[PDB]
Nucleic acid binder design. Structure first.
Ligand SMILES: [K+]
Ligand SMILES: [K+]
Ligand SMILES: [K+]
Ligand SMILES: [K+]
Ligand SMILES: [K+]
Ligand SMILES: [Mg+2]
Ligand SMILES: [Mg+2]
Ligand SMILES: [Mg+2]
Ligand SMILES: [Mg+2]
Ligand SMILES: [Mg+2]
Ligand SMILES: [Mg+2]
Ligand SMILES: [Mg+2]
Ligand SMILES: [Mg+2]
Ligand SMILES: [Mg+2]
Ligand SMILES: [Mg+2]
Ligand SMILES: [Mg+2]
Lengths: 235, 35, 57, 88, 154, 53, 31
RNA sequence: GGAUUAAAACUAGAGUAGCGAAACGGAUUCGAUACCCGUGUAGUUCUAGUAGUAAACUAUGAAUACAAUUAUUUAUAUAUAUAUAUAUAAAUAAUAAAUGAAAAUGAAAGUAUUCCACCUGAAGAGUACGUUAGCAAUAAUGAAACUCAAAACAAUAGACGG
């Protein structure tokens, strides 16, 4: 049959309807006693100009098409070259949109900081008026303004404590919950495995059919999936 | 002592108990006990 | 000569990502060592408030 | 991730390039800059093979192009003169 | 990896020279098949799975969590003040792999130097890899298999 | 010889592994954050001795 | 190579340098 | 392919104490274009460049896996009846094995694997010619003819040593 080769497109878009394909064949080199790969670039006809640099293609022998062209593209085995072209165009649009959004979020942050620098009022001073007015009874209009600078309509000892909250405090509680879950899951499964009877019951209670007839790994995974379905789904 | 310390140069325990309603929920607790 | 000659070291001039990060480092109240001014103002106010509460117990 | 590594290298490359522009005789740190730029090329070349979509997105955001990444680069004297690294 | 196999063959030679009774090799399928053939052929006293610190006494399932710390532990044999496993060399090298048809393997076992491979000697073991299985050359000839001539052990 | 060379992690094992690893990274970040605040507190205590006016 | 053998190369280099100085001088007068 | 690259040297502009090719003198000597002494120019210094060479040496390319000991430091870690002790690495020194023409190497010059550079008798010769590069000195590349049966290394025993 017609001689067919597999190769990588190494040049495209330089000649009209012609691409350069790199074909590698296996040969034996008697001198060094080693089976080597021999490489050759083929000028190949691309009637539809579909192939792109980087594509893996199969080329088939044809009639003479020019001084040096004797093969044509017969199939695109892998279209990595075509993918490269599509992803580059999308990237330009995708990145422009993201950069526009980030540029607007930077100017907004700058405006807020500039606005705050125009308000001579300071947190410490404001928190020293909400704690003196709340301990003296005075209600100068500054407080009403302070009830707008911060949004704190009510001036109580439990409102300054909520104006000065630090994110670290929230992190400290999320971390304790995370540690609890892991510790509970491990103790639960550890105990369950120690008692085969309580384990068999555990599985049946959660909806396993004849858990007794199961393997150690085929069933410990069920136990693990259940212990993690009784401490993460209920919570 | 932590939050309930007498040192002039205290640690972050005191500031944490304040923002966690502990130095206040203990002051009331002690006072309620005194009552 | 019509090729897109992009500096392989510094990249295209006026890249929005490069410029914005540079600008952020030169903002008025940027702090070092991982501190942010907003967290430092609340923390310093909390110290004062916390001291008053410890002086009211 | 390769995209993060390239971005982190970009920051250091930008800082080191600024140093070199003021210390054009500091060949020790010029060599360090060259190696770092080549390291960034290496990580991005792998990214193009591993996740082409992310690759093209990353280089566009960093201000580079495919040629800057694939082509052999030595940051040699001709580069310093063709891109006016030191100015005048 | 043929490189890993080369490392193991050299390692066994080094251990034999000093006459250590027990040593470890990397934990991989190829290494395990290689060691198992040596064990069945009487070159190794023992073959145990284990860790970086020693052979396992009780079965330890291998998983991604501990794969990096796994090792294969092999016992070397010595009789009459001579090592049983004196030499261990690759035939098919990383930079020059040798694939032979069953016809050429029969010539190699018959005294004919094929592709510069010295023929099989009395009491020597030549291993062949076919479809990712390692077997003695005589067994490959029995199964009419063509394969890569990996190494020779004496 | 018949034993499989490697047993892949079950989906559940990978979930518990990710929980521990996320916890490890979060705990270290928190401990560094708290250390920095404790240094900011000890610097506030001495800033009365520093001159800015 | 030993010092003894190095000395043979040393002599050849000296004679080449001596000849090139001699040629230079001539060029100066002939120029 | 690129970059950097001692000393000498070169192109400009500064500097010039001391040192110091050369040169001119003083000695020594049978002679002394030397060794020693004097006066001491270039140079040695700085700035901006050219050039890319050294016994540029460990005369030993880089990477990886691995093999028997001791000593001594260093580092990290651990413990305590708190200052040592126990661990794991690195460096250095002396070694086993192994290798080697031997001298010796010693974690490589050992056991192996991968990649690069390089060699194929002496002399002619790193010369000639050409080419490329440089302001230049030069640098890189780099032969053949003729002639010979030499030529070289480690080690041994002598002889000799102002
Ligand atoms: K035609
Ligand atoms: K090269
Ligand atoms: K001078
Ligand atoms: K030296
Ligand atoms: K090399
Ligand atoms: Mg690299
Ligand atoms: Mg030599
Ligand atoms: Mg001058
Ligand atoms: Mg003199
Ligand atoms: Mg130069
Ligand atoms: Mg020279
Ligand atoms: Mg040289
Ligand atoms: Mg030197
Ligand atoms: Mg390296
Ligand atoms: Mg020359
Ligand atoms: Mg000798």
């Amino acid at each position: 049959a017609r001689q067919n080769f597999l190769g990588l497109v190494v040049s495209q878009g330089k000649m009209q309807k012609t691409v350069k394909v790199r074909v590698e064949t296996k040969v034996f080199n008697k001198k060094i006693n080693k089976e080597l790969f021999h490489r050759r670039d083929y000028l190949v006809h691309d009637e539809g100009e579909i192939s792109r640099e980087g594509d893996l293609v199969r080329i088939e022998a044809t009639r003479p098409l020019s001084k040096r062209k004797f093969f044509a593209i017969a199939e695109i085995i892998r279209n990595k070259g075509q993918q490269f072209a599509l992803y580059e165009s999308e990237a330009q649009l995708s990145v422009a949109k993201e950069e526009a959004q980030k540029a607007k979020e930077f100017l907004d942050k700058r405006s807020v900081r500039e606005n705050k620098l125009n308000e001579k009022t300071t947190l410490l001073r404001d928190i020293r008026t909400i704690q003196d007015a709340l301990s003296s009874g005075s209600t100068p209009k500054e407080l009403l303004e302070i009830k707008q600078r911060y949004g704190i309509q009510d001036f109580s000892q439990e409102t300054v404590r909520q104006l000065l909250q630090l994110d670290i405090s929230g992190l400290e509680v999320n971390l304790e919950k995370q540690r609890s879950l892991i510790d509970r899951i491990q103790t639960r499964l550890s105990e369950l495995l120690s008692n085969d009877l309580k384990c068999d019951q555990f599985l049946k209670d959660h909806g396993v059919e004849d858990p007794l007839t199961l393997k150690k790994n085929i069933k410990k995974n069920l136990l693990r999936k259940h212990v993690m379905m009784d401490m993460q789904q209920p919570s | 002592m932590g939050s309930l310390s007498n040192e002039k140069f205290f640690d972050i325990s005191l500031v944490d108990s304040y923002l966690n309603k502990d130095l206040k929920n203990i002051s009331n607790k002690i006072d309620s006990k005194l009552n | 000569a019509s090729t897109d000659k992009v500096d392989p070291v510094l990249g295209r001039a006026d890249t929005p990502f490069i410029t914005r990060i540079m600008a952020e480092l030169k903002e008025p109240l940027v702090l070092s060592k991982g501190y942010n001014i907003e967290e430092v103002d609340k923390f310093l106010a909390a110290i004062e408030s916390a001291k008053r509460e410890r002086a009211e117990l | 991730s390769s995209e993060v590594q390239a971005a982190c290298m970009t920051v250091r490359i930008q800082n080191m390039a600024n140093h070199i522009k003021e210390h054009r005789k500091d060949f020790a740190n010029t060599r360090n800059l060259r190696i770092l730029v080549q390291q960034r090329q290496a990580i991005l070349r792998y990214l193009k093979r591993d996740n082409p979509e992310k690759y093209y997105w990353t280089i566009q955001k960093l201000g580079l192009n495919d040629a800057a990444i694939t082509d052999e680069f030595n940051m040699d004297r001709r580069y310093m003169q063709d891109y006016e690294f030191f100015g005048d | 990896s043929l490189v890993k196999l080369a490392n193991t063959c050299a390692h066994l030679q080094n251990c034999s020279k000093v006459r250590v009774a027990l040593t470890s090799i990397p934990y991989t399928k190829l290494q395990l098949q290689f060691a198992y053939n040596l064990y069945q052929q009487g070159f190794l006293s023992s073959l145990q799975k284990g860790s970086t610190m020693g052979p396992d006494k009780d079965f330890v399932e291998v998983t991604p969590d501990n794969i990096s710390t796994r090792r294969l532990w092999v016992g070397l044999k010595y009789r009459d003040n001579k090592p049983v496993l004196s030499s261990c060399k690759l035939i098919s090298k990383p930079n020059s792999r040798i694939h032979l048809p069953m016809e050429d393997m029969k010539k190699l076992c018959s005294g004919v130097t094929i592709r510069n491979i010295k023929p099989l000697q009395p009491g020597e073991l030549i291993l062949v890899r076919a479809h990712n299985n390692i077997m003695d050359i005589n067994e490959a000839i029995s199964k009419k298999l063509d394969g890569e001539v990996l190494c020779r052990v004496k | 010889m018949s034993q499989p060379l490697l047993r892949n992690r079950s989906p559940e094992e990978s979930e518990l592994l990710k929980l521990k690893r996320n916890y490890n990274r979060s705990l270290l970040n928190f401990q560094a954050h708290k250390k920095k605040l404790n240094e900011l507190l000890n610097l506030y205590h001495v800033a009365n001795e520093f001159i800015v006016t | 190579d030993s010092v003894m053998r190095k000395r043979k190369k040393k002599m050849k280099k000296h004679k080449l340098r001596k000849r090139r100085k001699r040629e230079k001088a001539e060029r100066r007068k002939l120029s």
